[PDB]
Design an enzyme around this catalytic site. Structure first.
Site, mmCIF file in Angstrom:
data_model
loop_
_atom_site.group_PDB
_atom_site.id
_atom_site.type_symbol
_atom_site.label_atom_id
_atom_site.label_comp_id
_atom_site.label_asym_id
_atom_site.label_seq_id
_atom_site.Cartn_x
_atom_site.Cartn_y
_atom_site.Cartn_z
ATOM 1 N N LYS A 103 0.809 -0.993 0.036
ATOM 2 C CA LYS A 103 0.087 0.042 -0.068
ATOM 3 C C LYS A 103 0.952 1.458 0.069
ATOM 4 C CE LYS A 103 -3.944 -2.131 2.420
ATOM 5 N NZ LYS A 103 -4.936 -2.032 3.298
ATOM 6 N N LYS A 149 -14.225 -10.860 1.086
ATOM 7 C CA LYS A 149 -15.420 -9.685 1.616
ATOM 8 C C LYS A 149 -14.879 -8.460 0.729
ATOM 9 C CE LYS A 149 -12.450 -11.956 4.147
ATOM 10 N NZ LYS A 149 -11.241 -12.627 3.335
ATOM 11 N N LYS A 179 -10.442 -16.439 -4.668
ATOM 12 C CA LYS A 179 -11.039 -16.916 -3.559
ATOM 13 C C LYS A 179 -12.161 -15.957 -3.167
ATOM 14 C CE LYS A 179 -9.820 -16.062 1.485
ATOM 15 N NZ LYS A 179 -10.206 -14.618 1.511
#
Lengths: 326, 326
Positions: A111, A195, A192
């Site tokens: 990030k 969320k 996968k």
């Protein structure tokens, strides 16, 4: 008994994959092991957050965890920031961790590349995370393969603190979930179920209503063979669907294959949709029961109280070694 | 009244220059302003420290500050780590301060150059320091020119937090000391008297015994003229000695020059040694009275209690804005 610590990111959205992957296993483990469920709200503050949102998700998450089956008397469910020891311990560890160890963190370098200026919190959360774990002498830390690297640092820190100031922390161990039940994306069988997928059709939430679960399951990608047969790599989609069905219904993948012999996907999807809706209905009910009950705060209070009871004593011994205060 | 916050580094050694420069002046200001004297032990933990030492210096510093004249009822004297709000607030600010603002800190770039690996604390203390100040709505922060840059960052942080979450912190102001003297080194008239000088003969401690004060003052560098006359640049040494004499005795530099007309340095040094020993004797006595007196902990207790009483409420409002907890 052994101690298990688990941090929960406040986002009020846990996927059916999370429930199948570890969450559900916890409702059982909470009786054998000593479980600590901590809603890490101080970690969630490292990125832009909406004051009203964050505060709302903390309640949701606590409520939803209780709804899934977490026993507030068997386990400890508390909000991180309500236990000051976390911030206190976090600071002391920041003093023994080297700048290199922090800047080398791959979750950091990730990030720290796509932005002009990031919060210093995105580079200094490791020491805080390490504290969350080490403060409870936790033995097992259930983490994903993407976080193993993190448990590594917290292990090192502990050992380093032990040698420099004397044995105090318990070197934790990262145990991964029961293997197999890795629920994949409903739209990308190879990827996968996350969320944070850019496509809400790729996952099912414990709060998704019957209509959505039916809409999402009916869109689940399959193949062109048109036969309910398990097979990782050729029939990715259907195998994923068979996995979700099996773990939520109790029937093995063999029984299901047989049970759907000449059957097509139309009826398979239709049935899978019911077994999912039937599993979440109770959870969703209990969830609202908790959301609007004041017994929730009661549980979070007694939780912060039990966590603090331990953390404090641990921080006190830390200060002792370091040489702070009196 | 206005509030003044002052951090004290635990090193059980404050020079006669510090006493003359500001210490002796806070003893007066403590009645008009609202003084906060905080023994920053969490800051001292950013560099290697001896557990036994650090703990011992915290008591010494608190005792020595009381001995100089700080009124525990008029002012607040407390140990930083005994007020958790400091670590809590420190974390929240770390989340709004940019990595650039930290790595650009010249006090950082200084110690981050001469080492292979430094504690991450040497790069993350700014947010903690800013918290120490901002937590008490302090108005004036007495700092040296070498720390101005630091007050700048804490000012920015406050303002940034105020705009983003609403007016809460008080933008502090860095006020420079009265002094106007500036006690120089006893061995280098050009250099300043520092607690951290490589040569113990360069400074006098409030705890130095008569024998040492006499040995150190007798070695004070002078010149070859052999006349007690004030003059910054030609007679650096003697002027410094005259300054120390004047401020501790009350007699102006004029009176002293006259009073030592045909007098040589032998008698000057001899007299200056007495006026220094006579000024420290009482301080040293009161110091031991406090050190072995249990009334010391009593004061540090009630101090942490008054500091916490404020800090807590401030951190609670912080959490409110940020959106943490409930």
């Amino acid at each position: 008994m052994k101690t298990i610590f688990s941090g929960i990111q406040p986002s009020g959205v846990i996927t059916i994959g999370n429930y199948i992957g570890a969450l559900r296993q916890f409702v059982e483990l909470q009786h054998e092991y000593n479980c600590y469920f901590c809603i890490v709200d101080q970690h969630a503050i490292t990125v832009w957050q909406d004051p009203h949102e964050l505060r709302q998700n903390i309640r949701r998450l606590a409520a939803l965890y209780l709804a899934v089956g977490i026993d507030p008397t068997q386990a400890t469910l508390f909000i991180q920031s309500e236990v000051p020891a976390h911030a206190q311990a976090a600071w002391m560890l920041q003093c023994i961790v080297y700048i290199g160890e922090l800047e080398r963190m791959t979750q950091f370098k990730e990030k720290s590349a796509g932005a002009a200026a990031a919060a210093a919190g995105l580079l200094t959360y490791p020491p805080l995370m390490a504290a969350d774990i080490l403060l409870y002498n936790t033995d097992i830390v259930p983490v994903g393969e993407d976080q193993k690297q993190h448990i590594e640092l917290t292990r090192d820190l502990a050992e380093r603190f032990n040698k420099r100031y004397g044995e105090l922390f318990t070197i934790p161990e990262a145990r991964i979930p029961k293997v197999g039940a890795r629920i994949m994306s409903l739209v990308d069988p190879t990827k996968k179920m996350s969320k944070s997928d850019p496509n809400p059709k790729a996952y099912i939430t414990l709060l998704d209503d019957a209509k959505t679960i039916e809409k999402k399951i009916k869109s689940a990608v399959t193949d062109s063979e048109g036969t309910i047969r398990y097979d990782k790599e050729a029939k990715p989609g259907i195998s994923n669907l068979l996995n979700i069905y099996s773990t939520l219904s109790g029937q093995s993948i063999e029984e299901l294959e047989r049970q759907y012999e000449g059957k097509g996907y139309g009826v398979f999807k239709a049935d899978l949709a019911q077994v999912v809706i039937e599993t979440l209905r109770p959870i969703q009910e209990r969830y609202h029961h908790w959301m609007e009950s004041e017994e929730l705060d009661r549980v979070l209070d007694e939780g912060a109280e039990k966590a603090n009871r331990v953390a404090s004593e641990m921080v006190r011994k830390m200060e002792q070694a370091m040489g702070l205060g009196r």
